[PDB]
Enzyme design. Structure first.
Site, PDB file in Angstrom:
ATOM      1  N   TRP A 171      35.351  31.429  -3.290  1.00 20.66           N
ATOM      2  CA  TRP A 171      35.889  30.140  -3.688  1.00 20.66           C
ATOM      3  C   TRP A 171      34.737  29.252  -4.124  1.00 20.66           C
ATOM      4  O   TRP A 171      33.574  29.510  -3.808  1.00 20.66           O
ATOM      5  CB  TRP A 171      36.696  29.460  -2.569  1.00 20.66           C
ATOM      6  N   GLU A 208      29.412  23.354  -8.626  1.00 19.71           N
ATOM      7  CA  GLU A 208      29.481  24.304  -9.731  1.00 19.71           C
ATOM      8  C   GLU A 208      30.393  23.790 -10.837  1.00 19.71           C
ATOM      9  O   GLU A 208      30.045  23.854 -12.022  1.00 19.71           O
ATOM     10  CB  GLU A 208      29.978  25.662  -9.249  1.00 19.71           C
ATOM     11  N   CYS A 268      22.973  33.175  -3.248  1.00 25.98           N
ATOM     12  CA  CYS A 268      24.300  32.792  -2.778  1.00 25.98           C
ATOM     13  C   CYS A 268      24.178  31.856  -1.580  1.00 25.98           C
ATOM     14  O   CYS A 268      23.693  32.252  -0.514  1.00 25.98           O
ATOM     15  CB  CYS A 268      25.104  34.031  -2.413  1.00 25.98           C
ATOM     16  N   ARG A 282      26.799  32.623   1.990  1.00 26.76           N
ATOM     17  CA  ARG A 282      26.705  33.864   2.755  1.00 26.76           C
ATOM     18  C   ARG A 282      27.059  33.720   4.234  1.00 26.76           C
ATOM     19  O   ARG A 282      27.108  34.736   4.932  1.00 26.76           O
ATOM     20  CB  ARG A 282      25.305  34.456   2.628  1.00 26.76           C
TER      21      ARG A 282
HETATM   22  C1  HEM Z   1      33.113  32.545   0.029  1.00 25.40           C
HETATM   23  C2  HEM Z   1      32.714  31.516  -0.727  1.00 25.40           C
HETATM   24  C3  HEM Z   1      31.470  31.606  -1.652  1.00 25.40           C
HETATM   25  C4  HEM Z   1      30.797  30.543  -2.102  1.00 25.40           C
HETATM   26  C5  HEM Z   1      31.099  29.069  -1.768  1.00 25.40           C
HETATM   27  C6  HEM Z   1      29.714  31.003  -2.940  1.00 25.40           C
HETATM   28  C7  HEM Z   1      28.786  30.209  -3.580  1.00 25.40           C
HETATM   29  C8  HEM Z   1      27.914  30.631  -4.560  1.00 25.40           C
HETATM   30  C9  HEM Z   1      27.231  29.794  -5.518  1.00 25.40           C
HETATM   31  C10 HEM Z   1      27.339  28.262  -5.616  1.00 25.40           C
HETATM   32  C11 HEM Z   1      26.475  30.574  -6.293  1.00 25.40           C
HETATM   33  C12 HEM Z   1      25.586  30.080  -7.448  1.00 25.40           C
HETATM   34  C13 HEM Z   1      26.206  30.597  -8.738  1.00 25.40           C
HETATM   35  C14 HEM Z   1      25.813  29.752  -9.918  1.00 25.40           C
HETATM   36  O1  HEM Z   1      25.177  28.686  -9.723  1.00 25.40           O
HETATM   37  O2  HEM Z   1      26.161  30.154 -11.057  1.00 25.40           O
HETATM   38  C15 HEM Z   1      26.652  31.946  -5.868  1.00 25.40           C
HETATM   39  C16 HEM Z   1      26.052  33.067  -6.403  1.00 25.40           C
HETATM   40  C17 HEM Z   1      26.265  34.369  -6.006  1.00 25.40           C
HETATM   41  N1  HEM Z   1      27.213  34.786  -5.097  1.00 25.40           N
HETATM   42 FE1  HEM Z   1      28.188  33.562  -3.730  1.00 25.40          FE
HETATM   43  N2  HEM Z   1      29.772  32.381  -2.981  1.00 25.40           N
HETATM   44  C18 HEM Z   1      30.846  32.797  -2.215  1.00 25.40           C
HETATM   45  C19 HEM Z   1      31.222  34.114  -2.030  1.00 25.40           C
HETATM   46  C20 HEM Z   1      30.571  35.230  -2.518  1.00 25.40           C
HETATM   47  C21 HEM Z   1      31.054  36.603  -2.465  1.00 25.40           C
HETATM   48  C22 HEM Z   1      32.410  37.017  -1.837  1.00 25.40           C
HETATM   49  C23 HEM Z   1      30.132  37.383  -3.068  1.00 25.40           C
HETATM   50  C24 HEM Z   1      30.103  38.917  -3.281  1.00 25.40           C
HETATM   51  C25 HEM Z   1      30.783  39.783  -2.529  1.00 25.40           C
HETATM   52  C26 HEM Z   1      29.039  36.529  -3.499  1.00 25.40           C
HETATM   53  C27 HEM Z   1      27.891  36.943  -4.143  1.00 25.40           C
HETATM   54  C28 HEM Z   1      27.115  36.157  -4.964  1.00 25.40           C
HETATM   55  C29 HEM Z   1      26.050  36.610  -5.835  1.00 25.40           C
HETATM   56  C30 HEM Z   1      25.585  38.072  -6.008  1.00 25.40           C
HETATM   57  C31 HEM Z   1      25.547  35.541  -6.453  1.00 25.40           C
HETATM   58  C32 HEM Z   1      24.398  35.554  -7.476  1.00 25.40           C
HETATM   59  C33 HEM Z   1      25.011  35.224  -8.829  1.00 25.40           C
HETATM   60  C34 HEM Z   1      23.907  35.250  -9.838  1.00 25.40           C
HETATM   61  O3  HEM Z   1      22.776  35.659  -9.458  1.00 25.40           O
HETATM   62  O4  HEM Z   1      24.140  34.869 -11.013  1.00 25.40           O
HETATM   63  N3  HEM Z   1      29.342  35.228  -3.156  1.00 25.40           N
HETATM   64  N4  HEM Z   1      27.537  31.939  -4.806  1.00 25.40           N
HETATM   65  C1  LIG Z   2      25.615  33.012 -13.487  1.00 27.20           C
HETATM   66  N1  LIG Z   2      25.765  32.887 -12.024  1.00 27.20           N
HETATM   67  C2  LIG Z   2      26.861  33.740 -11.517  1.00 27.20           C
HETATM   68  C3  LIG Z   2      28.035  32.900 -11.063  1.00 27.20           C
HETATM   69  C4  LIG Z   2      28.627  32.021 -11.959  1.00 27.20           C
HETATM   70  N2  LIG Z   2      29.668  31.271 -11.590  1.00 27.20           N
HETATM   71  C5  LIG Z   2      30.164  31.346 -10.351  1.00 27.20           C
HETATM   72  C6  LIG Z   2      29.607  32.199  -9.402  1.00 27.20           C
HETATM   73  C7  LIG Z   2      30.241  32.239  -8.054  1.00 27.20           C
HETATM   74  C8  LIG Z   2      30.565  33.460  -7.477  1.00 27.20           C
HETATM   75  C9  LIG Z   2      31.192  33.497  -6.238  1.00 27.20           C
HETATM   76  C10 LIG Z   2      31.518  34.826  -5.617  1.00 27.20           C
HETATM   77  C11 LIG Z   2      31.494  32.307  -5.589  1.00 27.20           C
HETATM   78  C12 LIG Z   2      31.154  31.105  -6.209  1.00 27.20           C
HETATM   79  N3  LIG Z   2      31.444  29.919  -5.622  1.00 27.20           N
HETATM   80  N4  LIG Z   2      30.555  31.096  -7.420  1.00 27.20           N
HETATM   81  C13 LIG Z   2      28.531  33.005  -9.763  1.00 27.20           C
HETATM   82 CL    CL Z   3      31.728  28.980 -12.640  1.00 33.20          CL
END
Ligand code: HEM
Ligand code: A1A0E
Ligand code: CL
Ligand code: HEM
Ligand code: A1A0E
Ligand code: H4B
Ligand code: H4B
Ligand code: CL
Ligand code: GD3
Ligand code: GD3
Ligand code: GD3
Ligand code: ZN
Lengths: 401, 400
Positions: free
Chosen positions: B276, B281, B104, B107
């Site tokens: 958000w 993405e 993520c 964070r």
């Molecule tokens: C607040 C704005 C946030 C942004 C801009 C953001 C951004 C991202 C991005 C770009 C990814 C990559 C996902 C992908 O490429 O498919 C990601 C993954 C992830 N996010 Fe964040 N996120 C946010 C909030 C959060 C929140 C609120 C949580 C959980 C409480 C979180 C937990 C995770 C987790 C666990 C992943 C791993 C997903 C995976 O392994 O497939 N994120 N996030």
């Molecule tokens: C397969 N990866 C998991 C996944 C896929 N699409 C979007 C997100 C994602 C999740 C969150 C909380 C924020 C963000 N900006 N994006 C995560």
């Molecule tokens: Cl998505």
């Protein structure tokens, strides 16, 4: 054995080759360190045995007459001298395999096309310089670049190493300025200072080609100027942004790495410079746009009349793309070989396919293979990869100073 | 044994002492690195551990209430074979799990998380309104607010809740007289399930899918999402007036619903979290991946680019404009979005904060570096250590 998916297509393979990885990398089951840039006669004998086994497999003569003879020849030599000598064909095969085995090289589809210059009889730094100039002239070939390596004498007990102190054969000077900044290439501040300290008369331009500091065994380095007509350069211009030429930017034709150690069957070659041709993003993205390199991105974006006061206009992305366009156009105009990142990554995918059939896998460093712009637009982004260390190999080594 | 981590842009060095805690093991060995692969009575053990974290975080390690909460988890597992989390513990663990997600890049926000406690839920109908509260809250008319809803934990001998969709908002993917997909190819499966459970399929490229919500030991049930509740952004470009005519859209809320939240040994296979979007993405992966909407060549035709040679960098140019169109459209619609330059800069600040706070930060370089302009962002030049800390979001198999 690790299962490896391609996410664009759905392909699945298993990397059986990784099980033969002898030397160990930096990762453990606790933590992955894949993103880090920098990660006894009986043991000489086992490495040599394995390499001789590799060589006789390649000539479809495994277990044959000559094969047993060579293994026994090597053991006898190690027993009598503490070391052994490669036959010329073994050296050629080992240099090629070392390229083939290099996990961070995206150009390895070319690995079988390598001109190997045998300089293992080199006697002095002066002769070393002559060999290097012949390498540069052959490899440059007036802009129609040819891949080559020159192999200088191997490490051996009782004598120091041959070393090229410069990290590449062609480097631009980096001069610490008056007001703290650097004029020229900041990557090269240290080698620039070493050249001056060894009697070089520095220039004061941004694109001053450095002299070579060449070390013969148990000798201080000696300074050698490259003749300018040996160093082919490309002035950078842009096909449609005519003001780009006025930046006065240049780059050189030949990417020739000169500070790595070539290892073949336990033997070590601390001086073995090798060269190919550039992929455009090395120049256009890393060398020209890294904040700690020439750092031209904002100046270009301002000249492009982009809105540089907000990031969401993607002014950085737009200017980097046009800088890469300029590099490709300029090298194509100058008739100097270059490959763009789309073509390079597509041919690497073919290399992975070839290597899966030939060897059952391919060591590859995803972070180095995926280009520094437009990552997921290239097919390698979506290809899982397995990183591991095979020998023969090009290894990093400490700087001699 | 403490890994040296260098930033190559600045030359600064740190050591990740936090990696010494990595409980669950990753996929790598000294023999080979697998970092680029996408999917690689001891319940007391990690229940103790989690409780110890909490009371240290509130500066209450080794004092009165710390001792006390250690006993009831002892007693609850002895008397029932599991335990329930205190409210504040459900909150602290939800944030820490987000804090610990190596992939993520967002964070920097981990301390600001809204935790809805749906642990008294029961039935696919209760989930639907529980999920609908989350969505309308998180969406907040475009001023997005991070949020997680924690459905009841898993128990032996029965059930567990699951959301069958990978996200709360997914566009349908429909096969054809020739296989190839109209709509989102990534969703062809859940689309075929949603129809298979009796859903009237749309014809189009952006039909929002219904939800398959699974109460314990029940066949799932379909749930239409109220159209006014699914905020979407039509895509236009600031200067390319024809871009709107391509009819492209994306939704506002990224809400991951197929991941399993694990706190103190407890497991919540239904625990959707949302934030958000970062614009790559949508603009790079979702719209330009060859196996997603794959629109890159269409936009390059409209831009009259030279698609006949790779060295024109026509792919790079069209991709940048698609990202421009995403950022422009979301901002014009007043829907929260962050570009990859801003996002990665904030993550560098997060790494710096975490170095002081915990002596390191688990980070997956391949996932932190954006899919366009990688080396133009600071995270490219930052070495990173990847490892598993608990609490954590973990992947889980599909519920069939
Ligand atoms: C607040 C704005 C946030 C942004 C801009 C953001 C951004 C991202 C991005 C770009 C990814 C990559 C996902 C992908 O490429 O498919 C990601 C993954 C992830 N996010 Fe964040 N996120 C946010 C909030 C959060 C929140 C609120 C949580 C959980 C409480 C979180 C937990 C995770 C987790 C666990 C992943 C791993 C997903 C995976 O392994 O497939 N994120 N996030
Ligand atoms: C397969 N990866 C998991 C996944 C896929 N699409 C979007 C997100 C994602 C999740 C969150 C909380 C924020 C963000 N900006 N994006 C995560
Ligand atoms: Cl998505
Ligand atoms: C023929 C065209 C070639 C192309 C297009 C090419 C491309 C590349 C690129 C883009 C890199 C990453 C460089 C960086 O980011 O610093 C690289 C690394 C490397 N290449 Fe190739 N290369 C070519 C030829 C060769 C040859 C002839 C050899 C050796 C015989 C070789 C061996 C290596 C090695 C060992 C590395 C790793 C260097 C390091 O890790 O610092 N390459 N190559
Ligand atoms: C420290 N990085 C190693 C490095 C640096 N510069 C350039 C290259 C390189 C080397 C070769 C043979 C071809 C190429 N296209 N590029 C490798
Ligand atoms: C920290 C990070 O590993 C480092 O910046 C790497 C990333 N990938 C790279 N890839 C290539 N080809 N060349 C590089 O110098 C780097 N640098
Ligand atoms: C094979 C490779 O690991 C895979 O394509 C990864 C690379 N990095 C990624 N990074 C993010 N943020 N999201 C992804 O889906 C991926 N895909
Ligand atoms: Cl270079
Ligand atoms: Gd003009
Ligand atoms: Gd000026
Ligand atoms: Gd027209
Ligand atoms: Zn690893």
């Amino acid at each position: 054995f690790p299962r490896v998916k391609n996410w664009e297509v759905g392909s699945i393979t298993y990397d059986t080759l990784s099980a033969q990885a002898q030397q160990d990398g930096p990762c453990t089951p606790r933590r992955c360190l894949g993103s880090l840039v920098f990660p006894a006669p009986e043991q000489l004998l086992s490495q040599a045995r394995d390499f001789i086994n590799q060589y006789y497999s390649s000539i479809k003569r495994s277990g044959s007459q000559a094969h047993e003879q060579r293994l026994q020849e090597v053991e006898a030599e190690v027993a009598a001298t503490g070391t052994y000598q490669l036959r010329e064909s073994e050296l050629v095969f080992g240099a090629k395999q070392a390229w083939r085995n290099a996990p961070r090289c995206v150009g390895r589809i070319q690995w079988g096309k390598l001109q190997v210059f045998d300089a293992r009889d080199c006697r002095s730094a002066q002769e070393m310089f002559t060999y290097i100039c012949n390498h540069i002239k052959y490899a440059t070939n007036r802009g129609n670049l040819r891949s080559a390596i020159t192999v200088f004498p191997q490490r051996c007990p009782g004598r120091g190493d041959f070393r090229i102190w410069n990290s590449q054969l062609v480097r631009y000077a980096g001069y610490r300025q008056q007001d703290g900044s650097v004029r020229g290439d900041p990557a090269n501040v240290e080698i620039t200072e070493l050249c001056i300290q060894h009697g070089w008369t520095p220039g004061n331009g941004r694109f001053d080609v450095l002299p070579l500091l060449l070390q013969a065994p148990d000798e201080p380095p000696e300074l050698f100027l490259l003749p300018p007509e040996l160093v082919l350069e490309v002035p950078l211009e842009h096909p449609t942004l005519e003001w780009f030429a006025a930046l006065g930017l240049r780059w050189y034709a030949l990417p020739a790495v000169s500070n790595m150690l070539l290892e073949i069957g336990g033997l070590e070659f601390p001086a073995a410079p090798f060269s190919g041709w550039y992929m455009s993003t090395e120049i256009g993205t890393r060398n020209l746009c890294d904040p700690h390199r020439y750092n031209i991105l904002e100046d270009v974006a301002v000249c492009m009349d982009l809105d540089t006061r907000t990031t969401s206009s993607l002014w950085k992305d737009k200017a980097a793309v046009e800088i890469n366009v300029a590099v490709l156009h300029s090298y194509q105009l100058a008739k100097v070989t270059i490959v763009d990142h789309h073509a390079a990554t597509a041919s690497f995918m073919k290399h992975l396919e070839n290597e899966q059939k030939a060897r059952g896998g391919c060591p590859a460093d995803w972070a180095w293979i995926v280009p520094p712009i437009s990552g997921s637009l290239t097919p390698v982004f979506h290809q899982e990869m397995v990183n591991y260390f095979l020998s023969p190999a090009f290894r990093y080594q400490p700087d001699p100073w």
